[PDB]
């Protein structure tokens, strides 16, 4: 189709070389928002689990300033290998430096790229399979209860049904301590050019889902991209 493998996907969309492209603009909004959540709003703790990391690291760049350990996870093993190639500095890993430096810019140019990169590499110790449909999304791997579960652009796409979505939210809860943070970033797609129907139009329905899944909402913001910060009840 429009990309052949996870690396082709990365080369097509994450090179960050054109400031006015649709991809750069989306990526800047996601990134400003993650900097706000993890650096300004002080969402912080010891263990963060990243759900649907795919082959990308952009969603972890501000987070690694706030969490001691980050576990990266994905349903697709091929996504994880591409990710590992970068973490291990293996040959011909994707070049994340442009996105890395952008984030260093947002954070006030207190650090240059390599130091930031090294801090994320040190934070990441486990690279695991996740299946949001499973009562134990990480299967049989034991992991202490976490202080944060982060899901950027995964849940809406991973769950066709509202009932699937709700169960995933409860499945994710099983990975968290009481009081533990849930950070979702996702899109509420418009009806334009749409074939078939979608979970939401829309703020109210996403909130109800999160609340009824067992969380209290601390904040919800449109960026149709949205960010939501919740705490497990």
């Amino acid at each position: 189709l429009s990309h052949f493998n996870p690396r082709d996907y990365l080369e097509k969309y994450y090179k960050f070389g054109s400031r006015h492209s649709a991809e750069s603009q989306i990526l800047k909004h996601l990134l400003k928002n993650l900097f706000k959540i993890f650096c300004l709003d002080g969402v912080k703790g010891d263990l963060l689990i990243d759900i649907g990391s795919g082959p990308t690291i952009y969603q972890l760049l501000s987070a690694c300033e706030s969490f001691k350990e980050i576990v990266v996870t994905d349903y697709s093993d091929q996504n994880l290998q591409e990710l590992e190639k970068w973490l291990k500095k293996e040959p011909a890993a994707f070049d994340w430096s442009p996105v890395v430096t952008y984030v260093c810019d947002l954070e006030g140019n207190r650090v240059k790229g390599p130091e930031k990169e090294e801090k994320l590499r040190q934070a990441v110790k486990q690279v695991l399979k996740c299946d949001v449909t499973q009562s134990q999304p990480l299967g049989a791997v034991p992991l202490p209860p976490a202080d944060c579960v982060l899901s950027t652009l995964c849940l809406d796409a991973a769950c066709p049904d509202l009932p699937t979505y709700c169960r995933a939210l409860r499945n994710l809860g099983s990975l968290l301590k009481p009081g533990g943070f849930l950070v979702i970033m996702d899109a509420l797609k418009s009806s334009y050019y749409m074939i078939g129907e979608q979970k939401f139009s829309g703020r109210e329905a996403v909130e109800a889902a999160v609340k009824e899944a067992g969380y209290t909402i601390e904040w919800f913001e449109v960026i149709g991209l949205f960010s939501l910060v919740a705490r497990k009840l």
Binding site: H3, E23, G52, P55, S76, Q78, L153, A157
Partner: peptide, 9 residues
Amino acid sequence: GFPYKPXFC
């Protein structure tokens, strides 16, 4: 797909 990730995109 962007900004969905494989294999959703």
